[PDB]
Amino acid sequence: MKRLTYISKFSRPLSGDEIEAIGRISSQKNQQANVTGVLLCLDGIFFQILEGEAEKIDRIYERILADERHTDILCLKSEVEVQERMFPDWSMQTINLDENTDFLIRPIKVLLQTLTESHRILEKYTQPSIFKIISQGTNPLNIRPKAVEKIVFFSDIVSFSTFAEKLPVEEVVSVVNSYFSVCTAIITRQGGEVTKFIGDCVMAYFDGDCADQAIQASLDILMELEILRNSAPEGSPLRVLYSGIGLAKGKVIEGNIGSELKRDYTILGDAVNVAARLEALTRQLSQALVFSSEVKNSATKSWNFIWLTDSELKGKSESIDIYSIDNEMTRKSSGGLEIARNIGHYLERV
Amino acid sequence: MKRLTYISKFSRPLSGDEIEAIGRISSQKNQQANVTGVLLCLDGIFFQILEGEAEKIDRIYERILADERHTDILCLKSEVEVQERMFPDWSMQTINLDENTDFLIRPIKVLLQTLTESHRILEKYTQPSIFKIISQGTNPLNIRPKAVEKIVFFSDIVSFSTFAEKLPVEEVVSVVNSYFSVCTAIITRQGGEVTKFIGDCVMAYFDGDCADQAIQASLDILMELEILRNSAPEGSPLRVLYSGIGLAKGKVIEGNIGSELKRDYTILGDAVNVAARLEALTRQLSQALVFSSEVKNSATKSWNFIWLTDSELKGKSESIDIYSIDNEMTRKSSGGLEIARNIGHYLERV
Numbered sequence: 001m002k003r004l005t006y007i008s009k010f011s012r013p014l015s016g017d018e019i020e021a022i023g024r025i026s027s028q029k030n031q032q033a034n035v036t037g038v039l040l041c042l043d044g045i046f047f048q049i050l051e052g053e054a055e056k057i058d059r060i061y062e063r064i065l066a067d068e069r070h071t072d073i074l075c076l077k078s079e080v081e082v083q084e085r086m087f088p089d090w091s092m093q094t095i096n097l098d099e100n101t102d103f104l105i106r107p108i109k110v111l112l113q114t115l116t117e118s119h120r121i122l123e124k125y126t127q128p129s130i131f132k133i134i135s136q137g138t139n140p141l142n143i144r145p146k147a148v149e150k151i152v153f154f155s156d157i158v159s160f161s162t163f164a165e166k167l168p169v170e171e172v173v174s175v176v177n178s179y180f181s182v183c184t185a186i187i188t189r190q191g192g193e194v195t196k197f198i199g200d201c202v203m204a205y206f207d208g209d210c211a212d213q214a215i216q217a218s219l220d221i222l223m224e225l226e227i228l229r230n231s232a233p234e235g236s237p238l239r240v241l242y243s244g245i246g247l248a249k250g251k252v253i254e255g256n257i258g259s260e261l262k263r264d265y266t267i268l269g270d271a272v273n274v275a276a277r278l279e280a281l282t283r284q285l286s287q288a289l290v291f292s293s294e295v296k297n298s299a300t301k302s303w304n305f306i307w308l309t310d311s312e313l314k315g316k317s318e319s320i321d322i323y324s325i326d327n328e329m330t331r332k333s334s335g336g337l338e339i340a341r342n343i344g345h346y347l348e349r350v
Numbered sequence: 351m352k353r354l355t356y357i358s359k360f361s362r363p364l365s366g367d368e369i370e371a372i373g374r375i376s377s378q379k380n381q382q383a384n385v386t387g388v389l390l391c392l393d394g395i396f397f398q399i400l401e402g403e404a405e406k407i408d409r410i411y412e413r414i415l416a417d418e419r420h421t422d423i424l425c426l427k428s429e430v431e432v433q434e435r436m437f438p439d440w441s442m443q444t445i446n447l448d449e450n451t452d453f454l455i456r457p458i459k460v461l462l463q464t465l466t467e468s469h470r471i472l473e474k475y476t477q478p479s480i481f482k483i484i485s486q487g488t489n490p491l492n493i494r495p496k497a498v499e500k501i502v503f504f505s506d507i508v509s510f511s512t513f514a515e516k517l518p519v520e521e522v523v524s525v526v527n528s529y530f531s532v533c534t535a536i537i538t539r540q541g542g543e544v545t546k547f548i549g550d551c552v553m554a555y556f557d558g559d560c561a562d563q564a565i566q567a568s569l570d571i572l573m574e575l576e577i578l579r580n581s582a583p584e585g586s587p588l589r590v591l592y593s594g595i596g597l598a599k600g601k602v603i604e605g606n607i608g609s610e611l612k613r614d615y616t617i618l619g620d621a622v623n624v625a626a627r628l629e630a631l632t633r634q635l636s637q638a639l640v641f642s643s644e645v646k647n648s649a650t651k652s653w654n655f656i657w658l659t660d661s662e663l664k665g666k667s668e669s670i671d672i673y674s675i676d677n678e679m680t681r682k683s684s685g686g687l688e689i690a691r692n693i694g695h696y697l698e699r700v
């Protein structure tokens with residue numbers, strides 16, 4: 001059997017009518033599916049444990065995930081090898097702690113709420129991969145390191161130092177966070193993982209057989225930033241927000257890396273350095289998107305590849321053939337590298 | 351008034367004798383201090399809320415922090431402007447959920463435990479600064495960005511690519527994590543903050559008037575790594591673990607930086623780039639510790655400074671005078687840069 005524990009937030013205030021309507025329908029449908037567990041609600045927060053056959057649990061959770069009556073749904077625990085139920089006589093008992101006034105309940109209710117609020121804070125500072133791993137039924141702390149082929153993605157804001165020199169601190173942070181949000185949304189949708197931000201740089205990766213998705217993600221980012229630039233208000237710093245992007249491919253180490261008290265689930269390897277070094281060359285090469293021949297050859301779609309140069313850095317003493325893709329979007333984005341050389345006056349005036 | 355909520359783990363199994371001994375003494379001392387609240391215990395976990403006058407709360411918490419009967423003590427919430435108690439008739443009521451069997455308690459007990467276990471996982475992936483901010487009574491999500499003078503620290507492992515080429519993946523990760531742990535312990539003790547790991551690199555910062563502590567932290571790291579190298583088993587990769595370090599000083603932006611779902615409380619600015627670029631020069635300059643004249647002049651202690659070079663990168667088109675400190679430890683660590691040029695055979699044989 002499978003047992004799923006999640007928490008969620010009310011999308012909007014819910015009356016007593018609606019709360020017991022949820023319990024009513026949930027209990028009837030879980031009875032049919034031989035699913036048991038408990039649904040708790042407290043100050044506009046839901047907690048639910050559900051247990052039963054994995055296929056039935058997944059289909060129920062799928063409906064729960066689509067229910068517009070709550071949001072911020074976060075699976076805290078997925079157990080996929082359960083052989084004894086924890087709540088057998090209870091298709092879906094519902095408990096409302098708001099209407100509860102019992103003696104020892106008052107301190108436990110406060111603790112539940114404070115734990116949940118603290119957990120919601122830490123979620124905002126936690127890599128998305130950690131919650132994905134948890135939702136697959138794995139404790140991330142017990143993942144052992146492995147060598148894995150990845151496509152590594154590195155991007156940054158062109159002429160970012162001009163933004164920091166010219167704009168108030170709150171506007172600098174607004175620009176960087178807008179950029180990070182654009183990149184993160186598209187990378188994640190294309191099946192990649194944003195693993196680190198450093199300064200105004202994004203580091204991300206894709207499965208090693210997903211060069212096509214990494215390339216498409218990169219082109220979509222350039223496309224989204226074009227929409228952002230040309231839709232921004234007159235005088236907005238967003239009108240001169242341009243990105244450089246570099247991709248590389250290689251065997252890296254994936255796992256928990258860090259100090260005793262603080263680690264990241266992330267990657268380590270030469271392809272990280274290569275992606276960052278390629279991304280740095282975007283200005284010299286006058287191309288917003290650059291990538292290695294290994295990425296080029298790994299792709300299976302008929303992209304309009306253009307050879308740029310044979311270049312070296314390192315280290316390992318081997319030259320690297322560097323490519324881009326030639327289309328209207330990359331030409332426009334590459335012209336943006338030139339525009340961004342002289343945005344100081346424009347930014348001085350926001 | 352102040353109200354403090356924390357969680358902790360039993361250091362070792364505790365009997366019923368010891369649990370109520372804690373409640374007994376806690377209630378008597380809190381009665382004296384006019385402190386109220388509740389202490390809960392569940393499967394070897396403590397939860398406590400304490401409220402009263404700030405000075406009395408801090409002294410009680412100080413004793414609690416030193417009590418060897420629990421560990422992993424983590425403050426989840428500090429409220430410093432409380433004007434109404436939450437548990438007035440209760441100097442220190444103790445509730446034991448293990449011995450509890452009530453009806454609606456069983457699901458809430460399970461939820462408490464699952465929330466706590468999940469919270470303990472996220473703690474391991476959370477920057478230390480976030481818990482410090484929380485313990486000072488501030489929600490980190492509501493900190494606005496500010497310009498601040500910092501000393502920025504950047505360090506990495508010399509010839510790290512050789513480690514990755516020669517060692518099994520689990521040993522590579524063991525080495526990097528050992529290094530990260532050494533740096534993080536010393537930086538934190540010296541009043542700095544480790545804010546980011548990237549590859550085998552540590553990025554950290556200190557208050558802008560703390561160049562002396564940043565320099566001392568750097569020298570202590572070199573000292574600790576010497577002890578690590580010369581105490582490691584025969585053939586251990588740790589015997590050839592060397593670091594480079596660079597320090598810079600400048601006005602940076604500090605705040606919440608990232609995407610909508612994932613941010614870091616960290617810094618952004620030119621001094622981050624300068625520290626990393628200086629750290630990269632350690633090999634060319636044959637010096638394990640390098641820093642800018644701005645760091646040198648900001649220090650007030652009579653360090654044995656040595657001028658190394660007048661160098662440029664960027665960007666901003668200004669040359670930077672680069673210094674180190676000349677003592678036995680830096681000379682030994684700098685000779686290690688040379689040794690690390692040719693550790694491939696040594697590492698091939700572990």
Ligand SMILES: Cc1cc2nc3c(=O)[nH]c(=O)nc-3n(C[C@H](O)[C@H](O)[C@H](O)COP(=O)(O)O)c2cc1C
Nearest residue numbers: 022025026029030046050060063064067069070092
């Ligand atoms: C907090 C919450 C918990 C829910 N729990 C369950 C559940 O345990 N089982 C279930 O079948 N539906 C549950 N639902 C409702 C589903 O989202 C959905 O409304 C219903 O199952 C779909 O019924 P349908 O087959 O007509 O589409 C829950 C909804 C909410 C808001």
Ligand SMILES: Cc1cc2nc3c(=O)[nH]c(=O)nc-3n(C[C@H](O)[C@H](O)[C@H](O)COP(=O)(O)O)c2cc1C
Nearest residue numbers: 372375376379380396400410413414417419420442
């Ligand atoms: C889980 C736990 C909770 C505690 N809570 C309190 C408390 O609320 N108030 C208190 O005075 N001591 C509390 N203590 C005990 C203190 O750590 C310490 O033993 C005692 O207060 C010191 O007494 P002293 O003045 O003789 O040094 C707690 C201990 C543990 C393990």
